[PDB]
Amino acid sequence: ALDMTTLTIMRYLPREVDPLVYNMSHEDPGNVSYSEIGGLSEQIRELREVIELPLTNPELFQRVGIIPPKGCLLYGPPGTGKTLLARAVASQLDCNFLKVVSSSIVDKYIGESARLIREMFNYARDHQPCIIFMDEIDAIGGRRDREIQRTLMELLNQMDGFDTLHRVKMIMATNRPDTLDPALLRP
Amino acid sequence: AVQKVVVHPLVLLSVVDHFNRIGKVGNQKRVVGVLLGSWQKKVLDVSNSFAVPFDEDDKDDSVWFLDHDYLENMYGMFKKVNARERIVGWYHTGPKLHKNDIAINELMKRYCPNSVLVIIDVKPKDLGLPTEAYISVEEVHDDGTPTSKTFEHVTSEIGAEEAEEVGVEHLLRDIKDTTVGTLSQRITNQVHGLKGLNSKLLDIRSYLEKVATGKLPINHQIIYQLQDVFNLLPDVSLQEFVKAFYLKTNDQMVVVYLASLIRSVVALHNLINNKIANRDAEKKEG
Amino acid sequence: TRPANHRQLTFEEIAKSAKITVNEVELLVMKALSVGLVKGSIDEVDKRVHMTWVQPRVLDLQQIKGMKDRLEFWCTDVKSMEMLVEHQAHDILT
Amino acid sequence: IDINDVTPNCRVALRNDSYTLHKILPNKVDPLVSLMMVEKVPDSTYEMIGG
Amino acid sequence: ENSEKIKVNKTLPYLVSNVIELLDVKCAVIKTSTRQTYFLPVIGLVDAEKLKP
Amino acid sequence: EFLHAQEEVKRIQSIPLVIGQFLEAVDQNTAIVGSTTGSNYYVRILSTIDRELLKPNASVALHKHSNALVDVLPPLTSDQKPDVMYADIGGMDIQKQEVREAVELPLTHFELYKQIGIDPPRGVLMYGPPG
Amino acid sequence: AVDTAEQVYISSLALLKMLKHGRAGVPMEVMGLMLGEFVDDYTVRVIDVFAMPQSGTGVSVEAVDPVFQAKMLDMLKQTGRPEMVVGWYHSHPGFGCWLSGVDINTQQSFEALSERAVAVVVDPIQSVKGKVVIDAFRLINHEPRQTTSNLGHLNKPSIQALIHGLNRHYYSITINYRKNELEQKMLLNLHKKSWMEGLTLQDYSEHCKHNESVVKEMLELAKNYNKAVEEEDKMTPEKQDPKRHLEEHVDVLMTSNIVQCLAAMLDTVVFK
């Protein structure tokens, strides 16, 4: 914080929440449990092994030395329960959950979306154990209007910034995985 | 307790104005006013002060007016203009305390739990620190001496907020001496430091005279702190210290050698060019 | 007794002051430091001790007069140096 | 007042208040819009072309 | 008297703006409609509980 | 009085100062500068500043009100920096040496390979099974 | 009669009060009154200044609370200041000293009040780094004022108030500060060096680092000083770089080393 007379520094604040990011964290995901979701036992097990176990039980990962997977993306026909699965994971893990529709992150201001996603990942790092969920990621993850690609570059750079220690995880949901740029599809 | 009080230009100019105002017509040994300030950590910062109607008897040292309602509503209005500043401490200009003063401080304690008094000797224009600060103390003294309602010294210094700093600098500009003052100001500062050290040591002499002769009570305290001071002297001429001192002095000497030699070289370079230029002018004139 | 001018204590004088043998002076000084009442340092190869003080104590009026004398010598030296520097640096000082 | 010196686009400075056109200043070339593809006056000389 | 002094000091315009997270050392952050960030040592005439990001 | 004047000169360039970007100079005591507020200005340069520091893209601190240029400050795109070392490499020692001569020396010492006069390396080929 | 080049003496206490209140008010404009004496037709004295509560109306005549002003005046009369009020000051942060359209009318009312009341404009954010942007104005009712002396043009007006009317609707009056010898070196105690500060020995490690850096800079300066002297041939006869930079470096280095050695020596011989 700066004085408006001599501009000197006083009262250095911790960090900004970017109240949108406030909304995408403190948003009710429902009381859905693993029991309420049925037919995807293999998928539920895989997702809980990829996102729940690394978070709740990291010591296995650090001692054994496995780099925990940064995130997992969900694809399938409409109405198969990807979003429901994410809701169940959000509701049952006592943690900090982040969910935002991709279409909403895009803003008409110059470069506002890149700063938006940067601040989202900064909040996630700040508020570990934090979980960020992406629904309809193909809104911005599509194959290479200009600001979409500029913010996709920021997405790649920021989530490449995941240090091994961080207890933050990624879930992207989509209905047309083909349109996704192979840039994210890379290991 | 309170570890430090910092005093801004505005209060000291205000009390100087108050002293000139009262002594202009109603010349009196002192004038009394109220300070305003704020608390950081356990240090106090005082920048505001107003004169209050005050009167002291000459010798009864128990008879005194300090105006209650005037103080209250003046503080209220000063809060109206600026609400940060709350009542801390009271000032007076008398170069000496009085037996009557502790009653003034007790009254001021009604408005501030730890009210601090400040003596601002406006008439003195001398060695340094025209402000003295004192708090009220009441404790058993831990040594069997009778307890008493006492004033206790708290260190004070002058500090300025930026606006007061530019304001004071602008008025001081004509008489202002430069901050850097390469050699003149530094040597004068060292001489003034010797002067101040001599003055303080002579004051300590006079105190010890009065203590040994008995006209002043033995404080037991401070005097043993003074003995710690006397045992704290470094005792130079110890051999390895002499070696280190010679080493560092020789480093300073070689550095000043380099600077002086370069100064001589540049002096010669100016000299030769000046000779060449004036001789060129002389040769062209013919 | 001394304003550090002879504060390098020899073992013998502290031993006879404490009327104890030379072998216990080390324990004496170690106890004094351990209590926190002396911050000296001990040498054993010369048996002399590097003594520094931090704990003040009571003064009698006798000690008051002694202090006044030893402080008089010091302030006399300060005044000597003050007028010496003022004399030798008159043109620069002004 | 030497207005006839004021050709279009001379990068001419004003005053901070009341504008009151001040003085010409040097021109603005830095033709980076063209330099992205233009080669200016090139370096090649008939001597290092042989045959 | 205090209430009237506050009343003379709540005159339009109000420069509508958005709220950001609060801090303790209870105090608010504001993003202006003019697109500038300010921090308030005190939130103001409204209470911290009612407001939200 | 000269001490006073140079003290004031030092004072005019003190904090606070608004940073801007140096544009090419006009004259010994003035130049054009584009403030980080966006706007550009024709502004006198403080005579104390060493002119050699004024490279045509330098960041210069200016007086907040008068915009007078008073100081010159002393001066990667993505995860491109990969944070992987030859220690992590699974011992492709022959390939290590081949590429290290191929690129690492050119990226480190291309001026020697320029004094050779050969248009120092431009392209090497990586070939093998997919991963 | 018709006024003249005139003068306005404001005291040290008044100036500091004005500056402090202005720096308190920024970025909202604040205003208050000064007490003083209409000593004569050729100068006006103001001593002491009291600020008054900041109402939401901004700097205007309505911002002047009659009750606050009247009882402040009464209590100052009791405390020993019977000074009758002429002059009002207000703050213009972010822009120069000039009377705005509101200010014209406020000063018109103030002039109607006494006759020769003077307006004062202070910019608390431009009055910084040792420069104070203070100025004082009076409104005109052909001939703006009588110029019977040369002490009217010892100063120069400014373009900002020029367009805003520094001669058009109002005229600026030269400002003087009536400091005295008692306030002098009473204020100076603020930067006054203490005797312990005089005998302070700085820091030997830091002093060695300083000498280390400055001698290296001396070497790098002398390197190009050699080139400069080796281009003595006088092609296209041309103060940047080697010569005066070397001068300032030798000056500061020599004075620092001399003062450090002298302080160390004085401490060695005087302190035991």
Ligand SMILES: Nc1ncnc2c1ncn2[C@@H]1O[C@H](COP(=O)(O)OP(=O)(O)OP(=O)(O)O)[C@@H](O)[C@H]1O
């Ligand atoms: N296996 C399942 N068990 C129970 N309910 C299911 C299952 N699959 C889908 N549903 C229900 O069908 C609806 C599908 O909603 P949801 O948004 O989760 O679908 P989706 O396939 O993930 O789509 P999208 O990716 O477009 O959001 C929900 O109401 C959910 O309760």
Ligand SMILES: [Mg+2]
């Ligand atoms: Mg979905």
Ligand SMILES: [Zn+2]
């Ligand atoms: Zn105004």
